[PDB]
Design a binder for these strands. Structure first.
Ligand SMILES: [Mg+2]
Ligand SMILES: [Mg+2]
Ligand SMILES: [Mg+2]
Ligand SMILES: [Mg+2]
Ligand SMILES: [Mg+2]
Ligand SMILES: [Mg+2]
Lengths: 114, 124, 79, 96, 135, 98, 206
RNA sequence: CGGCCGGGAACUCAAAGGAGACUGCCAGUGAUAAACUGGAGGAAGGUGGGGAUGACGUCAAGUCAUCAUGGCCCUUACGACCAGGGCUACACACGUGCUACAAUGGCGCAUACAAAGAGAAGCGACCUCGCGAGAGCAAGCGGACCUCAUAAAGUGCGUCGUAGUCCGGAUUGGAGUCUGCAACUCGACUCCAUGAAGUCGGAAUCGCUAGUAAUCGUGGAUCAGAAUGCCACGGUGAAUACG
């Protein structure tokens, strides 16, 4: 099952096995299995060519895994060439969405740099 | 007129009626087994009646509002004993040895000033 | 993400848009306001954003679609 | 108290009751979907200090913006002062 | 209690087997006030161990309490309280899946009673009969 | 047929105010139900007693508002004058409707 | 400081309020604002009248105001000026309808606003203070007052430190809520400081 | 099939006055006295439990920033007015807290049990569209009637079977909504996708004697908009005291 990238998930319920691939999560998984008419309590055992390519076509109706990555990259390049406040915080590693820079921003700032 | 005891316990209030029929359960039109007769502390309604023959000797009818599960259960526990002025006062010696006549005074305590939960002095 | 149904723009900046477009690149454009949203008619303009004491000469590029003035001009000198 | 700030808040009420609560129909009906005539959001900018959003609702006798509550108007200091001098019907220290 | 003696305000016993000791035990294993998800694990573990012991029910842990009963540190109330506490906090450390089954494996090793419960007992019980000077 | 709802604070004020409206009702009146106590929706406040720091020194107060309701049904025109002019409205306000 | 205030706690117990109207939850703030207006302006115009205390009442959208004083002759006057002018400017504050009354305070030294305003007005008359404390204690104690004490505070006689020297005779059960207690507080303004005086009066049991 | 119409007046419910708990009677100890233990009944036992109630004084503790107020200082400027930036910056330490690190857990479905509150420039049922966060309509409610609103752990079933896992939710891209002139310096929420460290915490350190310790919800005040903060209420509900 070389679908959507390198992931061959196995022995999972498909409702989580579709979250297992980058760029696709829970609600998208539920909608894909509804559009393919697949029960939630199935396993990846006994899977066929139809059960590959119907899933891949229904997810190829969606933005996945390569162009999403370079879309994030192109948004970041657009903000850096913009030189906005948010672009400056993206380029210098500071929390963008209205946080406090003073205390406890270590997800964005990394570990403590003395 | 019907043999009645009110009974109340920890923000609950029951209404307990006794006929001399059979000891099966109607609660807000529901089974004991459909309220907690399978679940936790199932025989807290049965416990005062255990001291005599109780199985099918008297009909019982309870309408309760207020509190939670054990609040209503303790309200029943007190309401049955409250309604036990039907037969006599003179079965209640071993009932006082059980102490079930005692109206509960273990009321909850208020949130006080400068504290988080009612006795909780915060850390410093 | 914001500004539900019709954005909010500025009176005098809106006027100075036509005061520069219909009358040529006289000066850089001077506003004490940092609010209005960039529309593609504004391409080719030197405007000024005041940061607290000082103006920055903002030029507008094509990909400034839903973007904002003070979002282009931060107001904190660092280090 | 800064009686200057007191007179400011007087002006904040006095300009408010002239325009707003009555000319706010412009935001209400016309700045709303009727399906365009965008001249009303062109005209959207007003003298704008008549908005009660710019009103603090300070203390009444002292003009402090803290101690305040809309039920009494005076700050909590004057609440205690008056409440202990009497001065409020049906008010005493709570107890349960 | 610098001044007062106990009155030991009591509780209600077990529903099914009617043991006040088991009621104290579900009070022990209770955290955050959940007798129901205590007792489901409790009665499921006890109904496993009844089959896994082939004996009665109440003696099946009377054995498991007497054999993990220490001597000193002492009074029997603290003995049969710390015994149950020892069984709980012994089963807390096990790498098994569920609480009832790790309690069952702890009681099995306390049935062939060289378990981690008597391992925890026989350090204070080791200080006993080896440091008999202090009084 | 009438909804007469009386409003005051002090209980000692309002019960001796309403005793002589109950007696005025059933002295020469008709279809009188009794004064309804109408549980006090008293309002509680807790405010900082220090001007400065010590948040943990505060002070609690409450305001207790009593109400009454009359509910006379029969159109007792004989006693509607007896209820008028004997108001002696010592700080009690009513609202009346259906 | 460290004490609770004794007047606003004995309210529904042994000594009622002196403002017991009823107002709606909307315009209550403007109501008490106007009440503060009449308190301030009444005390200001009746500086030398020695106002004991005043009652605000709202008898069905009018305002009843009662003036308790031991000195009503200066309030009444020659029946034309010193009452109806007061109710007139009370009405002229916000167009509100006004009734007005007085109330004789018998035993004319047993109000603490009277005692504290006496010492307040007697400070700037350039005397010493222990004489006046002794005076008030002796004369109210011979003329009644089952308990009494004083407290002064701040800048006494040009000294550096704010000394107190509270002074008592009688019996003042401050915790005991049944005790009939008259109490107020006035404030002076000297040429170099602001003095605070508290004064407790114990009438009786219940 | 809903307290819903004739109603009953007894019970809940709610507020007025009374009772009652005071060592008041019993035994032993105790100078013959207050007191200690135990008993009876009583719903309640020696303050029934809990709030309010904080003596003289120390700490020249703090508060001229609520206000009053002595003295000083300024008075074409430290005063008065507008626009805009800034207490929300960030190489770092500490305090207060929040959410988890999981299986007593998380998910999905079916699922029963309260309290005190608030409300008119306010609360907002009901229907229709959007998966949803929202928009229009307008009933009622100055209020035990109407609104906030169908609270959650709990129980059965099916589940994931020990992993950085369906646990956890930061950070970030996009698209939204509503508020308010105004969302860049700043918010609140829905959704799509992302899934860092964190597998129980070094030395040290905090609280707590019964409905509390802990856990799970809710309401208010501030407000035009927010809570993990403050104030208040309810559900379940422990251990130990030899000393
Ligand atoms: Mg001033
Ligand atoms: Mg505001
Ligand atoms: Mg006391
Ligand atoms: Mg200082
Ligand atoms: Mg204690
Ligand atoms: Mg907190």
């Amino acid at each position: 099952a070389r679908i959507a990238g390198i992931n061959i998930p196995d022995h999972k319920h498909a409702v989580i096995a579709l979250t297992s691939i980058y760029g696709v999560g829970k609600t998208r998984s539920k909608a894909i299995l509804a559009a393919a008419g697949i029960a939630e309590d199935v396993k990846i055992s006994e899977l066929s060519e139809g059960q590959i390519d119907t899933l891949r076509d229904e997810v190829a109706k969606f933005v996945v895994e390569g162009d999403l990555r370079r879309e994030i990259s192109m948004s970041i390049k657009r903000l850096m060439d913009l030189g906005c406040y948010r672009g400056l915080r993206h380029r210098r590693g500071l929390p963008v969405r209205g946080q406090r820079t003073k205390t406890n921003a270590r997800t964005r700032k990394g570990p403590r740099k003395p | 007129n019907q043999y009645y005891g009110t009974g109340r316990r920890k923000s609950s209030a029951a209404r307990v009626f006794i006929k001399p029929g059979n000891g099966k359960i109607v609660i807000n039109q529901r089974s004991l087994e459909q309220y907690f007769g399978r679940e936790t502390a199932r025989m807290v309604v049965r416990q005062p009646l255990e001291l005599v023959d109780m199985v099918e000797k008297l009909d019982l009818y309870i309408t309760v509002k207020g509190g939670g599960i054990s609040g209503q259960a303790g309200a029943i526990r007190h309401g049955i004993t409250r309604a036990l002025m039907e037969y006599d006062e003179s079965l209640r010696s071993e009932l006082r040895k059980a102490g079930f006549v005692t109206r509960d005074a273990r009321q909850v305590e208020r949130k006080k000033v400068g504290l988080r939960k009612a006795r909780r002095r915060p850390q410093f | 993400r914001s500004l539900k149904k019709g954005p909010f723009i500025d009176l005098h900046l809106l006027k100075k848009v036509e005061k520069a477009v219909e009358s040529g690149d006289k000066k850089p454009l001077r506003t004490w306001s940092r609010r209005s949203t960039i529309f593609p008619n504004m391409i080719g303009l030197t405007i000024a954003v005041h940061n607290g004491r000082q103006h920055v000469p903002v030029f507008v590029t094509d990909e400034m679609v839903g973007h904002k003035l003070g979002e282009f001009a931060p107001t904190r000198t660092y280090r | 108290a800064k009686q200057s700030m007191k007179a400011r808040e007087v002006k904040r009420v006095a300009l408010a009751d002239k325009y707003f609560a009555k000319r706010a129909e412009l935001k209400a009906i016309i700045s709303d979907v009727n399906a365009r005539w965008n001249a009303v959001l062109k005209l959207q900018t007003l003298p704008r200090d008549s908005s009660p959003s710019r009103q603090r609702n300070r203390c009444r006798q002292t003009g402090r913006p803290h101690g305040f509550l809309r039920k009494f108007g005076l700050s909590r200091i004057k609440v205690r002062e008056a409440a202990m001098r009497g001065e409020i019907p049906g008010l005493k220290k709570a107890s349960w | 209690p610098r001044r007062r003696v106990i009155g030991q305000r009591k509780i209600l016993p077990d529903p099914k087997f009617g043991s006040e000791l088991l009621a104290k035990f579900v009070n022990i294993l209770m955290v955050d006030g959940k007798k129901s998800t205590a007792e489901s694990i409790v009665y499921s573990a006890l109904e496993t161990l009844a089959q896994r012991s082939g004996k009665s029910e109440l003696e099946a842990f009377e054995v498991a309490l007497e054999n993990v009963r220490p001597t000193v540190e002492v009074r029997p109330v603290r003995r049969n309280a710390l015994a149950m506490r020892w069984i709980v906090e012994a089963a807390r450390k096990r790498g098994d899946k569920s609480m009832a089954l790790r309690l069952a494996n702890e009681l099995s090793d306390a049935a062939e009673n060289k378990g981690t419960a008597v391992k925890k007992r026989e350090d204070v019980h080791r200080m006993a009969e080896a440091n008999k000077a202090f009084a | 047929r009438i909804r007469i709802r009386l409003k005051a604070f002090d209980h000692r004020l309002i019960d001796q105010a309403t005793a002589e409206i109950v007696e005025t009702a059933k002295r020469t009146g008709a279809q009188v139900r009794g004064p309804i106590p109408l549980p006090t929706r008293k309002e509680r406040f807790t405010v900082l007693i220090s001007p400065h720091v010590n948040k943990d020194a505060r002070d609690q107060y409450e305001i207790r508002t009593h109400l009454r309701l009359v509910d006379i049904v029969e159109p007792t025109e004989k006693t509607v004058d007896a209820l008028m002019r004997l108001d002696l409205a010592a700080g009690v306000d009513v609202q009346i409707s259906l | 400081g460290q004490k609770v205030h004794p007047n606003g706690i004995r309210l529904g117990i042994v000594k009622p309020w002196n403002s017991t109207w009823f107002a709606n939850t909307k315009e209550f703030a403007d109501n008490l604002d106007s009440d503060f207006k009449v308190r301030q302006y009444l005390t200001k115009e009746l500086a030398k009248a020695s106002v004991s205390r005043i009652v605000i009442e709202r008898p069905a959208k009018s305002i009843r105001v009662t003036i308790h004083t031991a000195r009503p002759g200066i309030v009444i006057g020659k029946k034309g000026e010193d009452v109806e002018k007061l109710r007139k400017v009370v009405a002229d504050i916000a167009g509100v309808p006004a009734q007005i009354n007085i109330a004789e305070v018998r035993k004319p030294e047993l109000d603490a606003k009277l005692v504290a305003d006496s010492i307040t007005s007697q400070l700037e008359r350039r005397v010493m203070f222990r004489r006046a404390m002794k005076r008030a204690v002796q004369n109210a104690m011979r003329l009644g007052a089952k308990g009494i004490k004083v407290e002064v505070s701040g800048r006494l006689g040009g000294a550096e430190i704010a000394r107190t020297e509270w002074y008592r005779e009688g019996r003042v059960p401050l915790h005991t809520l049944r005790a009939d207690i008259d109490y107020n507080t006035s404030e002076a303004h000297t040429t170099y400081g602001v003095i605070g005086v508290k004064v407790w009066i114990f009438k009786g049991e219940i």
